[PDB]
Design a protein around this ligand. Structure first.
Ligand code: YHF
Ligand code: YHF
Ligand code: YHF
Ligand code: CL
Ligand code: CL
Ligand code: CL
Lengths: 648, 515, 655
């Protein structure tokens, strides 16, 4: 499905001199043209890819036991396997083997919230801190295969917390520091962890995150948790429960600074990551580790002495893959950025780049757009010439933001890599190789090694041949870092990703292939309602009403309201196998509204819930029609009258 | 009265050429390699060729009868589930692993290695989710449905010790075995079916569990879907539990001498077998005693609740990566032609049954067997008891149509694999005789009164073994003293089978039953 | 810091013919001179020592998985690592691999308390009993990483108890059989063990140790203990608690005689040993195992058919390293000695040596002092010629005891190895290599392979360069068998050993390095004093002072002298039934000197004769002659004591 050659220019930004091995920069791993990418990429998919993947696995990672089979399983039953017979350890490949080679080399550039508090953490320090925690965890009784929940802000010990679980064969489950008590509670209960690692307080952008207060509130509804390990990030007074709670530093003081590595099967679960019932995406060890290491080495052209600056949070897969696992497996310096893009000033990113001579920067378009609105003076006068690659992740990067990234952050001398992937992909799925691909602003370009993607017509289900087609993005074969299951919910795993288009992996995103073969991912434009000052998306309320099994389809719109600013109005149609006769229509309305209140909050409950035979549809739901009906525009295909009656 | 290997066992008529042949001299030449002073090289070669090891072994054998410290390949590590499922699935996932002959013939179907492995991994994941660890006993109470193999191999996959109880034992019999192994998880079925009759397995299980304080989880297979009593919390449905689990599960790396299973003989005597030696013994006996070849379809009509089902339904055949049969019905349901309807239906290449079944079908009449094809068969096996010459010829004349080799296989639960049997491509058979010992088996006749070994031929006495063999039972569960007393004390330096035996003038062994 | 060559003699005892490959004895592993020790020792420290240690690790031990890194970590944070990626099993290296090679070879010479009850235990028997116990422990639920407390006397099954824990990956915590219930309770609670292995009763020297009686008393305050496995050492009636207590023989009768080996990481903890708050010294598996195996092989010059007789107790690190792990790792015969040095007669050691033809003997100077007080008749007429190496461990050895060891046990044909080490060092740290190093009485000589020691001036904090310097002993680099932590108290570990002198390990003992470079722990001690050209032994001059009946004890020391080269200084204490009132103290000083002059000559009179209330002594009875030497030399400001006021009294009489 990929082009054999991408010609021409004038809308193509070719790899700049810094990515051509000129000006003393390293020669790129893949280059110099598109044909060089295809030549290698074809080796990683299709007929002889086993030889390629076996070689990369043995080169990239340190194994205790060699593997015999390269790959097995597939989408149909969710039995994906990569290098199944081999054994290894994530902590060994990210800490031990590098500490053995260069102990004093910096592993983490810890950019603290306050710039003066920033410092470098070496591989020796990170490993010793990781081993102390692992020894603490073993003393609590944590065994191989046990879940450990982590609720940590962007301080450097979070990597030690992750790697400690990976060291002993435990399954860490990171929860974004800043999640509510209810959100943390659901994830803690779902993974059935008995140990929680958290901090007393968080710090970000000069504001304090009351983590331990949130943890205490959440733990009241988490009966399984027995031990809490509390990092003294600020040292301020926080409530501590006797017996349950112990101090991280005090506990580590009793333990040795070395801890042996558990020999893990390639398919032993490495972690659970809940996407924002909670969906705990489960990743294996060897395939995920190889995927992060290879994507970092090629998508960002990382080289042995590089300093990689990913400004994401470890609560998202970006921090998992491209702050901790990817960079540390490659033995390079990685950045843990505790602050915000504009604290203390909108030059924070660029002070960081010149301070540490960062070679790659990896952030989200929301940060890029924020800095553009702050002004050129915060970026125009910096050096930034240590950078070679600038990365965008999380959402489409708009043409204005792409050029600002290129003109000021890169000074027209960096390659811009727009990366598309998901929590379930484990590593970057579609992204330009900076030394080979000429980029188009807003395009993720071409699939990574091991990714064989295609566009499927959502209506017919058939694969769209050729260019200038749009549909839904699918993958044809499993890749090493693919999620292996959803924790204790394999049925939801198969239904969500393997059932909708059989024989394929369903990303769930719209995509386009334009004319040169460049891939374009479509985003989401779900409407936003301002209820009493709170921004509610119509998707959340529609996703909340559908949890009532028996509801087939919903479409919520927003109308004006004299009391709340705006009100949520919801149209609901029940599934045929319901026979709604044991309940009056008003009983279901109260039931559904209470349901949304419990799951989104006391403000997202619909004002009126209209039960209708069917929603108005074309071939999507005509929400513009529904909005006008709620707003008294019936004066301005038969269901429309039915909807008018139920509203009037 | 000597039956030489027939044309189907000579490489004629398109059949595969036998592994050992064509004469007695060919059997002796290889057999001498497997016993005595320099046999370690042969066994080391066979162990490495037959099985997939995660870690190699250094020592071949150690220990002996005196203290029951038998060791084979002790430093090596491997997994029974890997050698029976994974390695074959990686080579040919669509190959039939189990021919599931249901009680109703129309409900029969083929289960691939892909399906058997996926189901095994799901159950293992359920067991791990229950907290089952390596070394834990798990009791299995299952009728002859194909998931019984998945249940067995799931325990072996995670290093648990499965303990099968024949579906049909009373609640007290199930209770005694469940309590003895101290298992906390029981795998059973809602109902079993055999011969048009329903086995109230879950009903029996509930009665037994009232006297089993240790059992915390019961995994209930929905074999029939009829309403059976289920205890909230304790009891869960097999399909619902597996629906939540992934279809792959990693293999626990097991020491060669890690226990593979407990099998209680009908105080309960729990015979314990290790992993590597048992696995190697069953695989070699199946390959040689039945002359199995890669595309063969092996039909052993035993029950998985007996050692015969353990060795020659599940472990032996699946280790060789061939097709094995799980026969849920009886020899005479729906008609006394069921065995022969089955053989032609699936083109079975070997049949393995008991003389009790042979005598049952012979008394039913020739009309049920004479008109079948049966020409896919090459070897007919008898096990469990001496086979009468009347029963032997009826087996040979109608089932084999005088074109199959008859293997009378003698062994015991404690031997793990076949001990004395003719090699079908080399040994000429005598009706009712087990002939000669298998590779690694060094047997002799001892004068029971004097305790001395009877030299020469045409002698009768008791059968003893001189050296341990790889698949020998290693102990009796938590009753090692009973193990030594029953087998190692009566004739010190020997293994005492407990059967009288005679060796004729030609050297053939004739088993005479118990002492 | 080490000498390149040790010259001369006359205070140097060169390796005797039994340690030269003469008289049919094996040629020593290191020899024949000091230069040969340095040539090998230099390979074990410094720049290229990883290659030497990697070779030794692979040659000495059987690994399930090979290691990649040789060493890492260090003193600063207590993250010491040796061969971290490798896997092995102590029970495999101590039992299985030797059993596979020679099953009938004697593993333990079990010398029972009654000599007639002694017998040989083969490797096959020891392994079978180890596997039976390990199987029992697994049935109790003991998992890899679980602590098991052991309270056992010196019966041979103690090795089976230890190695059973190592076989399944449990962490055994040995408690000296004879500790009170309170001492046993604290150790049992501190390691949080749930299984205790003990005996019904112990026997030593005709007296019975009421072990099960003590165990029951302690267990009343041990809520975590669920199972007690009781060895039937005597078969006498002992209280047994239903459920908790089971018989060792009965439990093993139900179990198989083989048990698979748990594949242990190099740095997996092998055992906890609490020193007499309790300090639980924790040792890893591979580094400890290699250290004990190498020290036994080289410090005692062990050979495949040797019979090693270490008379220690397994409740101490000496029993851990040089009864069980070291010798059994080398696959040789080891001795478990259940009796005392004087039961049934003070000739028990020498009856034992001739009975089993022991090739090395390893005991404590405290034991040597007991037998020396019993008389020469118990040793003069024995054979003892199967011995080649005589070892002393536990405390500084005075020259008088050293010569008695050398003259009678060795018949002046054995090398005496004075071994200095600690529970925290795991294996011998400083000791002569018997086939290469010439010995000085009372000196530990030179460091072992991998030990890089130095003397630091405590006042200045700087390391003392050169020879004839004394200060405190420190080690410069980690060694394989170093203890890795104090159980759940790593802060105490760093503070006790790594904080006092950063970058160094602080032994806590003073040491001196003489002009020849020999290390003297706790101080130099005098043997022969050269007064006006005559060689005087401290024994002769002390034997002369004791002829004055009324004198109870004397101890003469030597200092430099500008007129006689060296001067004899004598400390004398009179018998209680003397009533020293008819003579001024100066009158007795002249009288004693004239007596020594009359009996040894006009040159042997001591320069000063100090009358003191009592000589300084330790709780073991050792007269601290090293203290007395320092006091006479004006080092009372720098300087186990049973009476600390005796030292001050001595300082006053000298100053
Ligand atoms: N380059 C991109 N262009 C357009 N959309 C993108 C792009 N990258 C991601 N997305 C959307 O993010 C979802 C995945 O979110 P998540 O699983 O939370 O992972 C987070 C953390 C890392 C990836 C986002 C996709 O399914 C898409 O909807
Ligand atoms: N070919 C044979 N010829 C004569 N007797 C035989 C033969 N096979 C078995 N037996 C008797 O069955 C006992 C073993 O029974 P069991 O432990 O159930 O072993 C199982 C496995 C064999 C089938 C039952 C033997 O010891 C004998 O008594
Ligand atoms: N040869 C020796 N010369 C001088 N002093 C010595 C000597 N051996 C020991 N010590 C002192 O005993 C402590 C160690 O005792 P310990 O840890 O119980 O180990 C015991 C058990 C094995 C080692 C002794 C040292 O630190 C010293 O004070
Ligand atoms: Cl790199
Ligand atoms: Cl085959
Ligand atoms: Cl040796």
């Amino acid at each position: 499905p990929l082009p054999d050659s991408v010609p021409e220019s004038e809308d193509l930004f070719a790899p700049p001199p810094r990515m051509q091995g000129k000006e003393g920069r390293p020669k790129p791993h893949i280059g110099p043209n598109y044909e060089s990418y295809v030549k290698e990429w074809a080796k990683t998919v299709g007929p002889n890819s086993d030889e390629w993947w076996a070689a990369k696995a043995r080169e990239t990672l340190d194994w205790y036991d060699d593997f015999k089979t390269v790959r097995a399983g597939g989408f149909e039953h969710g039995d994906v396997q990569w290098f199944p017979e081999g054994t290894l350890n994530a902590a060994y490949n990210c800490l031990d083997r590098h500490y053995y080679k260069n102990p004093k080399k910096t592993a983490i550039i810890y950019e603290a919230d306050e710039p003066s508090e920033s410092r470098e953490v070496s591989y020796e320090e990170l490993m010793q801190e990781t081993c102390r925690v692992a020894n603490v965890l073993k003393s609590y009784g944590v065994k191989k295969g046990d879940a450990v929940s982590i609720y940590l802000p962007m301080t450097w010990q979070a990597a030690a917390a992750f790697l400690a679980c990976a060291r002993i064969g435990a399954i860490h489950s990171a929860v974004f520091a800043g999640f509510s008590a209810e959100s943390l509670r659901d994830r803690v209960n779902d993974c059935e962890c008995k140990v929680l690692i958290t901090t007393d307080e968080g710090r970000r952008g000069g504001k304090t995150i009351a983590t331990k207060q949130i943890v205490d509130a959440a733990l009241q509804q988490c009966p399984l948790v027995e031990n809490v390990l509390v990092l003294r990030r600020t040292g301020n007074k926080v409530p501590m429960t006797e017996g349950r709670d112990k101090w991280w530093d005090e506990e580590c003081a009793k333990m040795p600074a070395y801890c042996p590595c558990e020999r893990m099967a390639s398919e032993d679960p490495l972690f659970i990551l809940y996407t924002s019932k909670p969906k705990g995406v489960v990743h294996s060890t060897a395939g995920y580790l190889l995927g992060t290491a290879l994507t970092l080495k090629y998508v960002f052209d990382a080289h042995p002495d590089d300093r990689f600056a990913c400004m994401a949070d470890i609560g998202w897969i970006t921090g998992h893959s491209y702050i901790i696992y990817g960079p540390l497996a490659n033995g390079i310096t990685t950045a843990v950025f505790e602050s915000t893009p504009v604290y203390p000033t909108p030059s924070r990113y660029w002070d960081f780049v010149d301070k540490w001579k960062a070679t790659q920067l990896y952030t989200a378009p929301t940060a890029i757009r924020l800095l553009r609105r702050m002004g050129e003076d915060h970026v125009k006068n910096h050096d930034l010439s240590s950078l070679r690659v600038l990365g965008s992740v999380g959402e489409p990067i708009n043409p204005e933001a792409w050029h600002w990234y290129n003109d000021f952050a890169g000074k027209n001398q960096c390659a811009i890599v727009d990366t598309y992937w998901m929590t379930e992909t484990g590593s970057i799925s579609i992204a330009p190789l900076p030394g080979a691909i000429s980029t188009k602003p807003g395009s993720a370009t071409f699939p990574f090694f091991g990714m064989d993607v295609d566009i499927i017509d959502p209506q017919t289900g058939q694969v769209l041949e050729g260019n200038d087609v749009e549909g839904v993005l699918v993958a044809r074969r499993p890749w090493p870092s693919i999620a292996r299951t959803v924790y204790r919910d394999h049925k939801r795993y198969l239904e969500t990703y393997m059932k909708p288009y059989p024989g394929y992996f369903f990303f769930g995103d719209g995509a386009a292939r334009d004319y040169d073969g460049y891939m374009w991912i479509k985003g989401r434009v779900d409407d936003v309602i301002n209820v009493s000052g709170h921004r509610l998306s119509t998707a959340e309320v529609e996703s909340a009403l559908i949890l009532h099994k028996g509801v087939a389809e919903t479409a919520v719109v927003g109308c004006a309201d004299d009391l709340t600013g705006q009100a949520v109005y919801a149209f609901v149609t029940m599934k045929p196998e319901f026979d709604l006769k044991a309940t009056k229509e008003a009983d279901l309305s109260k039931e559904l509204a209470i349901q949304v209140r419990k799951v989104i909050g006391p403000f997202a409950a619909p004002k009126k819930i209209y039960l209708v035979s069917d929603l108005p549809k074309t071939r999507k739901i005509m929400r513009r029609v529904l909005r006008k009906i709620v707003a008294g525009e019936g004066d301005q295909p038969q269901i429309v009258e039915e909807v008018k009656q139920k509203v009037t």
